[PDB]
Amino acid sequence: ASHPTYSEMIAAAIRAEKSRGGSSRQSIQKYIKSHYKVGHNADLQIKLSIRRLLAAGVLKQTKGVGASGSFRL
Amino acid sequence: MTESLVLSPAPAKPKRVKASRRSASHPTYSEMIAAAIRAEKSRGGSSRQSIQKYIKSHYKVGHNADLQIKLSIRRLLAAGVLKQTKGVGASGSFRLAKSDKAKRSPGKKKKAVRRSTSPKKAARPRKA
């Protein structure tokens, strides 16, 4: 029933991921299965959060070969 | 290869016997400054004489502190291992590859909090 700070879930996700290419979208989704928002709006709410956080400049994305995403804090 | 790995770093045996079990594992050659910079409380970063102090415990000095400290610094910059911060008057700056802060920023300053207003503010909801 608790509401964790939605801004820092992504931060903790790439902090604990420990991956070379970066966190993939499935990786963030599977990381956030604690008691939180059910995620029916995930595909857009996460999109907006990454847009805002990258407007700040605290995220990265690179292209290559591997998982479906390469998001890095 | 001789003066790089066999002949010139032979002093590693006359000087560095500190790699052992029962904890107390002194870091190998590739990772001295790593421990010092993870155990850091500064804002600009570690410095040269500061690195000398942290690695001064039981680490052989030799000609390493003359050539190879900055040689390995440049090697890690070439390999994309560590970064630093530009400035004058900070007397040094060093940082390894750590993912804890923003990669870019337009430039700002941080803050600190001293609890002085919370006790006076606790009575406000009770007041009205």
Coordinates of C-alpha atoms in Angstrom, one line a residue:
Chain A
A1 CA 0.0 0.0 0.0
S2 CA 3.1 2.2 0.2
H3 CA 4.0 4.7 -2.5
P4 CA 7.7 4.8 -3.3
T5 CA 9.2 8.0 -4.8
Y6 CA 8.5 7.4 -8.5
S7 CA 11.5 9.5 -9.5
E8 CA 14.2 7.3 -7.8
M9 CA 12.9 3.9 -8.9
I10 CA 14.8 4.3 -12.2
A11 CA 17.9 5.5 -10.4
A12 CA 17.9 2.5 -8.2
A13 CA 17.2 0.3 -11.2
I14 CA 20.4 1.2 -13.0
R15 CA 22.3 1.5 -9.7
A16 CA 21.5 -2.2 -9.0
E17 CA 21.5 -3.5 -12.6
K18 CA 25.3 -3.8 -13.0
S19 CA 25.3 -4.3 -16.7
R20 CA 27.6 -3.4 -19.6
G21 CA 25.3 -2.1 -22.3
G22 CA 22.8 -0.6 -19.9
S23 CA 19.3 -1.3 -18.5
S24 CA 16.7 -2.5 -20.9
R25 CA 13.1 -1.6 -20.8
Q26 CA 12.2 -5.2 -19.8
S27 CA 14.9 -4.9 -17.1
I28 CA 13.4 -1.8 -15.5
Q29 CA 9.9 -3.4 -15.7
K30 CA 11.0 -6.6 -14.1
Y31 CA 13.0 -4.7 -11.5
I32 CA 9.9 -2.8 -10.4
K33 CA 7.6 -5.5 -9.1
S34 CA 7.5 -4.4 -5.5
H35 CA 4.3 -3.0 -4.0
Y36 CA 3.7 -0.1 -6.5
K37 CA 1.5 1.1 -9.3
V38 CA 0.0 -1.8 -11.2
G39 CA 1.6 -0.6 -14.4
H40 CA -1.4 -0.4 -16.8
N41 CA 0.0 3.0 -17.8
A42 CA 3.7 2.0 -17.6
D43 CA 4.5 2.3 -21.3
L44 CA 3.6 6.0 -21.2
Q45 CA 4.4 7.0 -17.6
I46 CA 7.9 5.5 -17.9
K47 CA 8.2 7.3 -21.2
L48 CA 7.4 10.6 -19.7
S49 CA 9.7 10.1 -16.8
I50 CA 12.6 9.2 -19.1
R51 CA 11.8 12.3 -21.2
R52 CA 11.9 14.6 -18.2
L53 CA 15.0 13.0 -16.7
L54 CA 16.8 13.2 -20.0
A55 CA 15.7 16.9 -20.3
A56 CA 17.6 17.2 -17.1
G57 CA 20.4 15.1 -18.5
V58 CA 20.7 12.2 -16.0
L59 CA 20.2 9.3 -18.5
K60 CA 21.7 7.9 -21.7
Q61 CA 20.9 5.6 -24.6
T62 CA 23.2 3.9 -27.0
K63 CA 22.7 1.5 -29.9
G64 CA 24.3 -1.9 -30.4
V65 CA 23.5 -5.6 -30.0
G66 CA 21.9 -7.1 -27.0
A67 CA 18.7 -6.6 -25.0
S68 CA 15.7 -4.6 -26.2
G69 CA 17.0 -1.4 -24.4
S70 CA 20.3 0.2 -23.3
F71 CA 19.2 2.9 -20.9
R72 CA 21.9 4.1 -18.5
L73 CA 21.8 6.6 -15.7
Chain B
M1 CA 58.4 -7.2 -21.9
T2 CA 61.3 -7.6 -19.5
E3 CA 61.4 -4.1 -18.1
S4 CA 57.6 -4.0 -18.2
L5 CA 56.6 -7.2 -16.5
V6 CA 59.6 -9.3 -15.4
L7 CA 62.8 -7.4 -14.8
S8 CA 61.9 -3.9 -13.7
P9 CA 58.8 -4.9 -11.6
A10 CA 60.8 -7.6 -9.8
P11 CA 60.9 -5.3 -6.7
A12 CA 57.3 -6.5 -6.3
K13 CA 58.7 -9.5 -4.5
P14 CA 61.3 -7.6 -2.5
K15 CA 58.6 -5.1 -1.6
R16 CA 55.0 -6.3 -2.2
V17 CA 54.2 -9.4 -0.2
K18 CA 50.9 -7.9 1.0
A19 CA 48.6 -10.0 -1.3
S20 CA 47.4 -12.7 1.1
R21 CA 44.4 -14.4 2.6
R22 CA 42.8 -13.6 6.0
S23 CA 41.5 -10.3 4.6
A24 CA 43.9 -7.4 4.7
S25 CA 44.3 -7.8 0.9
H26 CA 46.3 -4.9 -0.4
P27 CA 45.1 -4.1 -4.0
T28 CA 47.1 -5.2 -7.0
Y29 CA 48.8 -2.8 -9.3
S30 CA 45.8 -2.2 -11.6
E31 CA 43.5 -1.0 -8.7
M32 CA 45.3 1.1 -6.1
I33 CA 43.5 4.4 -6.5
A34 CA 40.1 2.6 -6.9
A35 CA 39.8 1.9 -3.1
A36 CA 41.0 5.4 -2.2
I37 CA 38.5 7.1 -4.5
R38 CA 35.5 5.0 -3.5
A39 CA 36.4 5.9 0.1
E40 CA 36.3 9.6 -0.6
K41 CA 34.5 12.5 1.0
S42 CA 35.6 15.3 -1.4
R43 CA 33.7 17.2 -4.2
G44 CA 36.5 17.8 -6.7
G45 CA 38.3 14.5 -6.3
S46 CA 41.5 12.9 -5.1
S47 CA 44.9 14.5 -5.8
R48 CA 48.5 13.5 -6.3
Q49 CA 49.9 13.9 -2.8
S50 CA 46.6 12.8 -1.4
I51 CA 47.0 9.5 -3.4
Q52 CA 50.5 9.4 -2.0
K53 CA 49.1 9.5 1.5
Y54 CA 46.4 6.9 1.0
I55 CA 48.8 4.5 -0.7
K56 CA 51.7 5.3 1.6
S57 CA 50.7 2.5 4.1
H58 CA 52.7 -0.5 2.8
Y59 CA 53.1 0.2 -0.9
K60 CA 56.5 0.3 -2.6
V61 CA 57.4 3.7 -3.8
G62 CA 60.4 3.1 -6.1
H63 CA 60.3 4.9 -9.5
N64 CA 56.6 4.1 -9.7
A65 CA 55.5 7.3 -7.9
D66 CA 57.7 9.2 -10.4
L67 CA 56.8 7.6 -13.8
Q68 CA 54.1 5.0 -13.5
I69 CA 51.5 6.8 -11.4
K70 CA 50.9 9.4 -14.1
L71 CA 51.7 6.8 -16.8
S72 CA 48.8 4.7 -15.5
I73 CA 46.6 7.8 -15.1
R74 CA 47.1 8.5 -18.8
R75 CA 46.6 4.8 -19.7
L76 CA 43.3 4.7 -17.9
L77 CA 42.2 8.0 -19.6
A78 CA 43.1 6.3 -22.9
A79 CA 41.1 3.2 -21.9
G80 CA 38.2 5.3 -20.7
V81 CA 38.5 4.2 -17.1
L82 CA 38.7 7.3 -15.0
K83 CA 37.7 11.0 -15.2
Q84 CA 38.6 14.2 -13.4
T85 CA 37.4 17.8 -12.8
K86 CA 39.1 20.8 -14.3
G87 CA 40.0 23.7 -12.0
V88 CA 42.7 25.7 -10.3
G89 CA 43.1 26.0 -6.6
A90 CA 41.5 22.6 -5.8
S91 CA 45.1 21.2 -6.0
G92 CA 44.0 18.1 -7.7
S93 CA 41.0 16.0 -9.0
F94 CA 40.5 12.3 -9.7
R95 CA 37.5 10.0 -10.2
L96 CA 37.1 6.5 -11.5
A97 CA 34.1 5.2 -13.5
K98 CA 31.3 5.5 -11.0
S99 CA 27.6 5.6 -11.9
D100 CA 26.0 7.6 -9.1
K101 CA 25.6 11.2 -10.5
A102 CA 24.4 13.1 -13.6
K103 CA 26.7 12.7 -16.6
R104 CA 26.2 16.3 -17.7
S105 CA 24.9 19.4 -15.9
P106 CA 24.7 23.1 -16.8
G107 CA 26.5 23.9 -13.5
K108 CA 25.1 24.4 -10.0
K109 CA 25.9 24.1 -6.3
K110 CA 24.6 21.7 -3.7
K111 CA 23.3 22.3 -0.2
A112 CA 23.3 21.1 3.4
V113 CA 20.5 21.0 6.0
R114 CA 20.7 22.0 9.7
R115 CA 17.7 21.0 11.8
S116 CA 16.8 24.4 13.4
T117 CA 13.2 25.0 12.1
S118 CA 11.6 21.6 12.6
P119 CA 11.1 21.8 16.4
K120 CA 9.4 25.2 16.0
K121 CA 7.4 23.9 13.1
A122 CA 6.1 20.8 14.8
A123 CA 3.7 23.0 16.9
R124 CA 2.2 24.8 13.8
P125 CA -0.2 21.9 12.8
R126 CA -1.1 21.6 16.5
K127 CA -1.6 25.3 16.7
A128 CA -3.8 25.6 13.7

